[PDB]
Structures are given as structure tokens and as C-alpha cells.
Amino acid sequence: AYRDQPLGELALSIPRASALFRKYDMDYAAGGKQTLARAAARKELDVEVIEAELAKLAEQPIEKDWRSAPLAEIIDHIIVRYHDRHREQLPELILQATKVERVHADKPSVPKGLTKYLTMLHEELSSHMMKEEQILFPMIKQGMGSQAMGPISVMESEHDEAGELLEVIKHTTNNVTPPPEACTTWKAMYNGINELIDDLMDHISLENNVLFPRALAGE
Ligand SMILES: [Cl-]
Ligand SMILES: [Fe+2]
Ligand SMILES: [Fe+3]
Ligand SMILES: [O]
Asked: Whose CA is nearest to atom 1 of ligand 4?
């Protein structure tokens, strides 16, 4: 019964589901508690076809399952696969968005505000990630995870705020869809933005749906 389960559990149960939920604009990352049924019903989307589509990906081979992995290993993976990657992705995107906004300032399709939104996301992610790396992650490794409600609730409120920046970024770029007159820089930047969104959603999902609850439970 896929419809009755939370989006978070589904995204970590079946591979490429993250991308499927991304296709339907379903927030499995910060909204991972919500059931597929409730999320589908709010979008006016056909639940039965989504259940089927999941089975097609479900039967496909298993990747790494992080739900039962050691927390220290989840932490190390997050730092390297996600935090360090965001630290190099964002400065590049900011440079490209600066160029696209300038060069194409005359065009009605130019993503006005994109540079400013990427800049805000970079500044906020950087202080957020530093706190995780300096305090929350070490505290979990040193066995104080059951004591981490304070930082965790703050980290979760900041994940929601990052979620809102992503929505504004998606809206400014026509859901990251380049117009017909887009150039190579403009197209490659939109590919970078989609890659940043995919990574950031999987990053937030791993924190909200696995690391944080299991830490608090004393694992
Ligand atoms: Cl606590
Ligand atoms: Fe993080
Ligand atoms: Fe985080
Ligand atoms: O994060």
C-alpha cells in the first residue's frame, strides 16, 4: 500500500523515486512525513498511476540503503557527497547567473532575481552547514544524539527556509526550463541548478528522514 506510506520512507525504500517525486513537485525532503495520498490529493494528481510507476522502479535493483547505516557513516557521506559539493556548485552558479542576467537583461524570459536568490541560498547554506559540521554532527558521533532536539529543530526550520528559496528559484526559471533563445551558458546553468536541487533534496531527506530521527532515538 504505497499511498498510505510517508513520502520520506518511499524515497529511501525505492530507487529513482526521488526523481519521480521531483517530477510531481512532491517534497519528500522537508515534507517527508506526509503520505503519498495526501500529497497527490493536494496536487489533483492520479494516485493509482503513481503507485504503478513506483512498482516499475521498485522491482529494479537496490542501491545503498541508508536507513540502517551507521550514523557516523551517514554523517561522513553527507559532508563529502553533499556539503563539499554545494560549496563548489553554488559559487559557479552565482557567476553564471550574473552573466545570464546581464547579457540577456533585454529579454522577457531572463530569470530576474536569480543571482540574488542563489546568493542568499549560498550564504544561508554555508552558515547552516558549518553549524552541522562544528556542533551537531560531532555531538551525534560522540553519542549525544538523544540530546540534540534543540539543534535538530533549528536545522529543520532552516531546511524549510532553503525549500522556500528553491521554490523561488524554480519560479524565476520557469521551473528550470530554458526558453528557446537560451544559449550554452544559460542551458548549462539550468542543468547545474537541477543538479543542485536534486542533491539538496536528497541531502535534506537524508537528514530529516534518517539521521535526525535515528539520532534522537539514541542510535
Ligand atoms: Cl533533546
Ligand atoms: Fe547538511
Ligand atoms: Fe542540514
Ligand atoms: O544541511
From this structure: 129
